[PDB]
RNA sequence: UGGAGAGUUUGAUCCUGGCUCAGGACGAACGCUGGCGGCGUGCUUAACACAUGCAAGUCGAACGGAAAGGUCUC
């Protein structure tokens, strides 16, 4: 009942005297589907072994993703090694819109409503690194208010204010 | 109230970087196919030459006149 999703399976090789020694890298994203997402690279001689290593080290690389009920709090732009991923919160109707590498990471994080765009490198691993960086950049109204010293109502816009309680009644 | 990516340089990698593809549109054309209706639409090239027909006519309450019809007649 806890979601895994592998994005890229890539066969690496190391060269020796005899010939080429092959290995597999298994970038996977593990997510609960509500707010918990982790990314694991994972490497092994065998494709399922790399899958498993990636899952196991993704589940120890967790971080909370601040949402407001299906979309992110505010728009960001994560910058990876060379990956650039732009995230814009979406109206509560239009669903996830994202590229192949990003889509898995935000679906595992559990967002239902997001605009994602890969502008930098097209490598999947650096794309997910950029998206993760953007989710780190994400901030919550209730801790931005503590950061700034002012209450909730005079830091967060009235739209997201009234859009919060519509989830939990 | 709104933004998706994939393949391809290497033994393998990450960038840079082009090329290609997945979508949509036409006053369209060609291949195959094909029932109808509604509503739109049809020389994008030779402002190249045109047979043939119509597309600018009207008033007898403006006038001199009687070519035709019907009349008063012989
Ligand atoms: Mg840069
Ligand atoms: Mg690029
Ligand atoms: Mg080269
Ligand atoms: Mg090759
Ligand atoms: Mg490219
Ligand atoms: Mg036919
Ligand atoms: Mg009709």
From Swiss-Prot:
UniProt free text on domains: The N-terminal domain interacts with the head of the 30S subunit; the C-terminal domain interacts with the body and contacts protein S4. The interaction surface between S4 and S5 is involved in control of translational fidelity.
Per UniProt, subunit arrangement is:
Part of the 30S ribosomal subunit. Contacts proteins S4 and S8.
Q: Which molecular-function annotation in GO is an example for this chain?
A: structural constituent of ribosome
Q: Which residues of the full protein are shown?
A: 41 to 209 of 220
Keyword entries, A-Z: Ribonucleoprotein, Ribosomal protein, RNA-binding, rRNA-binding
**Among its keywords, does the record have ATP-binding?**
no
The S5 DRBM domain covers which part of the protein? 2-65
Query: What does the sequence similarity comment in the record state about its family?
Result: Belongs to the universal ribosomal protein uS5 family.
Organism superkingdom = Bacteria
- Return the GO cellular component terms, semicolon-separated: small ribosomal subunit
Q: Which GO terms describe its biological process?
A: translation
Q: What is this protein called?
A: Small ribosomal subunit protein uS5
Which species is listed as the source?
Mycobacterium bovis (strain BCG / Pasteur 1173P2)
Q: Report the protein's function.
A: With S4 and S12 plays an important role in translational accuracy.
């Amino acid at each position: 009942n806890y979601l895994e999703r592998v994005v890229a399976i890539n066969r690496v090789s190391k060269v020796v005297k005899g010939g080429r020694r092959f290995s597999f890298t298994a970038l996977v994203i593990v997510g609960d589907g509500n707010g918990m997402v982790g990314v694991g690279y994972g490497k092994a001689k065998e494709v399922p072994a790399a899958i498993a290593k990636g899952v196991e080290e993704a589940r120890k690389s967790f971080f909370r993703v601040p949402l407001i009920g299906g979309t992110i709090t505010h728009p960001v732009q994560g910058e990876a090694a060379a990956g650039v991923v732009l995230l814009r919160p979406a109206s509560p109707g239009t669903g996830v819109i994202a590229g192949g590498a990003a889509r898995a990471v935000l679906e595992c994080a559990g967002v239902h409503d997001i605009l994602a765009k890969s502008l930098g490198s097209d490598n999947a691993i650096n794309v997910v690194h950029a998206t993760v960086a953007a989710l780190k950049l994400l901030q919550r109204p209730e801790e931005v208010a503590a950061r700034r010293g002012l209450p909730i109502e005079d830091v967060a816009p009235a739209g997201m204010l009234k859009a919060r309680r519509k989830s939990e009644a």
